[PDB]
Write a protein of this length. Structure first.
Lengths: 186, 53, 147, 125, 257, 66
RNA sequence: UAAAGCUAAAUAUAUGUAGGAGACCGAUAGCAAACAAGUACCGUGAGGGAAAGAUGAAAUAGUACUCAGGAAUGAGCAAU
RNA sequence: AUUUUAAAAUUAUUUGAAUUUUUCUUCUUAUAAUUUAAGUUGUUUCUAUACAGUACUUUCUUAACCCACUCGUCUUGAAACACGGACCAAGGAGUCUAGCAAAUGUGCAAGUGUAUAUGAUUCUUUAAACAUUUUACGCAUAAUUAAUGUAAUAUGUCUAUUGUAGAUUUGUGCCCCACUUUGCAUACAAUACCGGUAAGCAA
RNA sequence: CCUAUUAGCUGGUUAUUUUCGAAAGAUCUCUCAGGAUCGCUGGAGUUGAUUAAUAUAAUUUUACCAGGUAGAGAUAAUGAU
RNA sequence: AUUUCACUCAUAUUAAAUAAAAUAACUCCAAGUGGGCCAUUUUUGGUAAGCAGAACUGGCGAUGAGGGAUGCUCCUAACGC
RNA sequence: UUACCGAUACCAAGCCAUAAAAAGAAGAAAAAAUUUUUUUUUAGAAUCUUUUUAUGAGUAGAAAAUCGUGGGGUUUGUGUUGAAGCGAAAUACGUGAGUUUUCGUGGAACAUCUCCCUAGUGCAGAUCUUGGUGGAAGUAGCAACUAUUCAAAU
RNA sequence: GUCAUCUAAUUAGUGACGCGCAUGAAUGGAUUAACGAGAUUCCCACUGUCCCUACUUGCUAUCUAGCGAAACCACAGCCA
């Protein structure tokens, strides 16, 4: 008998393997696991970790946010482990070198028309195997509507969680506990 | 009820097993309607079955 | 699907994962939304705050078509039209685009976002927001009311 | 008790039997984990029907091979024996039960000229 | 589905307070074996299954159109690579190239004899032999359900115009036809397997560019459909690894415990 | 019938199973209900600072970018 | 433009009849009933309601002959 | 198959030194070998000069030493003087549909799903596949108010609010490090702006 | 026949190995054989750490606080005596 | 008070010690549980109780093994072969 | 005061699994005969391979990986020189559910572990359902109605 | 309950007494010949009810030939 925590076995949390059985993504994961092991590059380690993540942690990054994040250094290349989506609110693009998992058709067309280029992660591993001049970016991992229902329960004081309701008219979840005139408010 | 779910709303408090129906014949009925209108355009023979609206 | 079900993995475990003590009985708390305000009140108040009571006045028969109006913000007006024509209207300063958002399916133009500086644009819509009109004529454009 | 035959250690023989299968006919001897509440065997009372556990697992260097230090491979015709042409030293062959007498003879002669040993060589003859 | 009221068409009575019998319902009366026997209940003989099968089971599935088109495109791509056609089970060791296309008179040929002869001349005699000697009566009681034989799947002839192809290549066991404008994923990937021997006619091969976007024409091109792009640009990850730019990038090999 | 009215047995070890969690102690705290006429004037202070900084930044950017 | 009237199609069909099918059940299952089944049988009555399929390719091969037995049967050097 | 190497120790020669002054004194100079390094090797017998036995392997049956209460269950507590179980076979219990969410996989992405339906040399299979003349509908893209309604920096700038940490990137001291540069996600706050309510004014 | 009515109650609830592993407190409840809710638990995932150091600690040390239980008293008060 | 510039306050042993401290933190979904009981020490009601009610910690429960002849809770000690 | 005996605890060593870690996407070694032969091997599957360290109770409950059954696609197979099933078994494999073989019986079908789909999919219990069969046991019992006997026939 | 009576002996019976837990008038009060498979006490007769059991008859049991169940059953069956 020995008095250890968790009986002496180190416990890790989070993903350990790719779940997607996409052969191309499996090949990419193999390549970047090898790259992360054989080079010291935290760049490659981060990319190898992010290729493994669920969909909700590879959110899209719009063109406007891409070109805003890459404003100050214009000759670098931006690498996103999500998808790049178009932004109709953006009036003009400018000469972006972007590596990404996937591009929507509109975003790809706009980037090539602006004269930049779209890169896959195998091309990124070919040309910048260490990540020189490569800026790691990610989209908003907490903007999705599911997070709007998370956190403190709707009903706890000063809670911002969205409740689960069929509809959102005046007669749905809006009388008692949501205004001072009916018992209390939140 | 339990946990953070939408408050349930299902209107199945009557004898619904008697009123459920499944359309196994959607495309079969498609073919039947197609055949019927084909035959009634061959019957009048040249004059369209469509009327001007 | 049936061979992936969790009950299959409790096949020889007596209680089927439902407790040796509490058991799996039928409606031990009531049926549907029974106990709200009495014995499910913590659940109702913790997850569905404003559930009980009524607020507001009745609208007897609604006819949603009367008040239906989809909205668009000013920052998407330029993206409404194609890229090449956007470039044309940008390069040429003597011409402006006239966009009838009602044709695209929008009835009201809202004022969120930024329009391009010194780029005139004429917008036709059934309804306009105050700030939407302010931005449109701040960039040298015009709002036209249609119906 | 463990038995050793060269490098082969079998950590236990006399395979585990189901609790009370000795004194109940409806209880077959095939092992079942006693779920129970006051179950003696489940509680690991002394002197009764010990349960299998992973600790009995055999060394994985010698885990699956037969008393001839060869892995068994079951074949149904002559075409399934091609891979053994370059595995003849570490695999032995066994003819499937439902193979007729001609296919049996053919398999035996092909295995002999491949010098691959056969386990059930004298069956149906 | 089972009959709606099956097992429950008797008189319910569980007269079970002190009879020294289990409290299950029993059929009434006397004078016959059935009287007093356990009535409906999943554990009783003639009692009714636990959850009687209903006809409103989810029989079908709605599949995204884009995903279906992706699957068809990928099946065609897979049929184009030799190792996949070999791995699926076709004996193609003797045909010259795997995206195999023949002249348009394959569509005009009309006799099963000359169809089999053309198959042999293309180098597919072993495949034809596999097809003809795969015919055999299946195991299980599917054969008391009008499912007697079980065949292997042979080449899929893809044509543009039916001038005799269908009525020349049908009746060859395991051979399936398909018009190029109605490509079916069920035929293209039988059983979900990857890479089916496809024999294209010249015109059917040429029409693929038209169908999938190149050289568009009005009533043939799939409207507003864009061929799926890949996550990677070139999947030769070992070639990229062996490229000198990243070989110079790698650190020295280290040692284990 | 009669039952155990109350006990705190096992409650401490339940509490220590997932530890006695500490408050996070964030660097900044909301000033919502705190000292009006001081935090409003702090808002004015910060606005003045930002405007004075930003006009220098605009001047420098304009004169370096023509 | 009420207090009179007619009107085909698109619609429904746990009934009857007749076709065709199935990732259905395979004789304690599937309809209650694969069979002489709503039959036998029970109840004054309204009603209740089963069990029960398989020799063999061929009985147009269903056991001939002998012995022992009152016979049923049995045995055979006899026989399909 | 590029650490059972190197070193360490020992032996035999060898260079110098030191010292407890020497037949195991120590420190290196070089070479050669060894193992005390760098997890067991050798010899001789037997099995046996057999083809399955009286041996060896194995199953079973019997003893013997030590141990061993009847399972399932409710229960704080069952071997219980708690209940169920004479035996055996076969049958026998978290499923199906609707609806919601989370998780994860997949496609597409400010969109997405082509609903009912239509067409079409497909009409064993096929009741499936295939297709849809450049504002059908759902959900999403905007909130808020009982509500008339109103509706997100704001044209000084295609710019993209402000801080504190922070991934990545850039330099100077292709691989450690302190300052530089950039500042993702996110957290904590600050600011604006939208709807409602107060308050002040109110043509 | 409606009807397989309902049951907070009793009985039963079907392969193996491996890994993690409780509660019998609490709040509300026509509540006391029940339920919801918190706590305890598993699974999933991210951010971190991976730099013998920071975060951190059912531990101490140093410094500084708060207490009226044991004891003590009855001549300090009160109440006894 | 905030903001910007300065200057610089141990770190090469870490602004006290020790630390299989990151086996962390956080989020999501969800199970079972919500009759407890026992021992030491404290303690209320009761003549008392294997009685009833509480506090701390450890247990039994959920757990076998060695010892206490025997024994759910005592002592040693917790369990792959 | 000594010695001794005495655990599933402790120590050293081996092996299994769990967790974590270090690391990884190509060349001849030996032996036996007689320079020439012969015998073995001569590896490279990333949820993989090699090595290392620590660790291992468990009800309720949760998860993973495995093992089976009916049926369906795909693949590639076994059957009258005897399939399925069944009885007894095995120098058999597995830790284990099981798997695989042998002999007998049987007389016509059967698998697919290549991958996948599907469900009416796994029994010791429910005074469970239906059927069959026990010990009880050659036992309780074959007891109201006074009563039978001789001889013959068949 | 107290007093009589009944007995050798009376928590029984009957006759009285009555501040009656809590009697009482068609909720009928009191009393009554005749009647009762109604409840109760005593007496004579009578007797195996008993002292105190014994002997005896039939039908079973018992053994045999024949026929032949069932209930109950976790496993079983010596004690301190």
């Amino acid at each position: 008998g020995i008095a250890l925590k968790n009986v002496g076995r180190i416990k890790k949390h989070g993903r350990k393997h790719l779940v997607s059985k996409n052969p191309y993504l499996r090949l990419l994961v193999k390549l970047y696991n090898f790259l992360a092991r054989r080079t010291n590059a935290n760049f490659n380690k981060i990319i190898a970790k992010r290729l493994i993540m669920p969909k909700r942690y590879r959110p899209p990054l719009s063109l406007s946010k891409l070109q805003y994040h890459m404003a100050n250094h214009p000759n670098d290349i931006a690498v996103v482990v999500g998808s790049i989506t178009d932004d109709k609110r953006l009036f003009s693009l400018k000469q972006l070198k972007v590596c990404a998992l996937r591009f929507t058709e509109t975003a790809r067309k706009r980037i090539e028309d602006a004269g930049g280029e779209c890169l896959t992660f195998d091309q990124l591993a070919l040309k910048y195997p260490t990540g020189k001049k490569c800026v790691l970016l990610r989209g908003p991992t907490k903007a999705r509507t599911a997070e709007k229902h998370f956190g403190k329960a709707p009903g706890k004081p000063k809670s911002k969680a969205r409740p689960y309701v069929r509809s959102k008219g005046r007669k749905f979840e809006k009388a008692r506990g949501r205004r001072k005139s009916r018992a209390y408010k939140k | 009820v339990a946990h953070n779910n939408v408050l349930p709303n299902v209107h199945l408090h009557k004898w619904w097993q008697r009123h459920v129906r499944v359309n196994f014949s959607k495309n079969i009925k498609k073919k039947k309607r197609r055949l019927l209108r084909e035959k009634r355009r061959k019957a009048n023979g040249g004059t369209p079955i469509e009327k001007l609206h | 699907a049936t061979r992936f079900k969790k009950n299959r993995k409790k096949r020889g475990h007596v209680s089927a994962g439902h407790g040796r003590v509490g058991k799996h009985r039928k409606h031990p708390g009531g049926r549907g939304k029974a106990g709200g305000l009495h014995h499910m009140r913590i659940n109702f108040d913790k997850y569905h705050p404003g559930y009980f009571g009524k607020v507001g006045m009745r609208h007897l028969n609604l006819l949603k078509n009367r008040t239906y109006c989809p909205t668009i913000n000013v920052d998407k007006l330029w993206g409404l039209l194609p890229e090449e024509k956007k470039k044309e209207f940008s390069e040429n300063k003597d011409i402006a685009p006239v966009i009838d958002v009602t044709r695209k399916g929008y009835f009201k133009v809202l004022g969120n976002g930024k329009l391009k500086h010194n780029q005139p644009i004429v917008v036709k819509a059934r309804y306009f927001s105050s700030v939407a009109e302010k931005k449109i004529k701040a960039v040298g454009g015009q709002c036209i009311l249609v119906a | 008790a463990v038995k050793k035959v060269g490098k082969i250690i079998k950590k236990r023989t006399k395979k585990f039997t189901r609790f009370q299968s000795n004194r109940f006919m409806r209880v077959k001897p095939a092992w079942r984990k006693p779920r129970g509440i006051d179950c003696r065997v489940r509680r690991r009372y002394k002197g009764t029907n010990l349960m299998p556990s992973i600790g009995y697992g055999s060394n994985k260097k010698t885990k699956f091979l037969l008393p001839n230090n060869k892995y068994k491979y079951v074949v149904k015709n002559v075409k399934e024996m091609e891979p053994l042409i370059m595995n003849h030293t570490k695999y032995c062959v066994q003819i499937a039960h439902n193979v007729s007498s001609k296919k049996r003879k053919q398999i035996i002669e092909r295995a002999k000229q491949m010098n691959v040993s056969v386990i059930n060589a004298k069956a149906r003859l | 589905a089972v009959k709606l009221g099956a097992g429950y068409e008797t008189s319910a009575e569980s007269w079970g307070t002190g009879r020294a019998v289990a409290r299950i319902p029993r059929v009434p009366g006397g004078g016959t074996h059935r009287a007093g026997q356990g009535a409906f209940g999943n554990m009783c003989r003639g009692g009714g299954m636990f959850n009687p099968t209903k006809i409103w089971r989810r029989w079908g599935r709605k599949v995204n159109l884009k995903e279906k088109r992706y699957a068809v495109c990928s099946s065609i791509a897979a049929s184009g690579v030799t190792s996949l056609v070999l791995a699926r089970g076709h004996r193609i060791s003797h045909l010259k190239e795997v995206p195999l296309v023949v002249s348009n008179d394959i569509e005009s040929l009309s006799k099963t004899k000359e169809a089999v002869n053309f198959l042999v001349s293309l180098g597919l005699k072993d495949e034809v032999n596999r097809l003809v000697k795969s015919k055999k009566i299946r195991a299980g009681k599917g054969k008391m359900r009008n499912r007697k034989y079980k065949i292997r799947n042979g080449p899929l002839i893809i044509y543009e115009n039916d001038n005799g192809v269908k009525k020349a290549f049908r009746n060859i066991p395991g051979v399936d036809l398909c018009k190029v404008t109605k490509l079916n994923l069920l035929k293209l990937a039988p059983g979900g397997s990857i890479g089916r021997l496809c024999i294209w006619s010249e015109s059917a091969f040429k029409k693929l560019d038209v169908i999938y976007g190149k050289i568009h024409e009005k009533k043939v091109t799939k409207k507003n459909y864009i061929l799926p792009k890949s996550i990677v640009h070139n999947p030769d990850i070992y070639r990229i690894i062996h490229s000198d730019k990243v070989q110079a990038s790698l650190l020295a090999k280290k040692k284990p415990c | 019938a009669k039952s155990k009215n109350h006990t705190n047995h096992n409650q401490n070890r339940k509490a220590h199973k997932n530890g006695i969690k500490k408050p996070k102690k964030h660097k900044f705290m909301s000033r919502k209900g705190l000292d009006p006429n001081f935090f409003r004037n702090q808002k004015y202070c910060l606005k003045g600072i930002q405007k004075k900084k930003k006009e220098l930044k605009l001047k420098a950017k304009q004169e370096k970018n023509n």
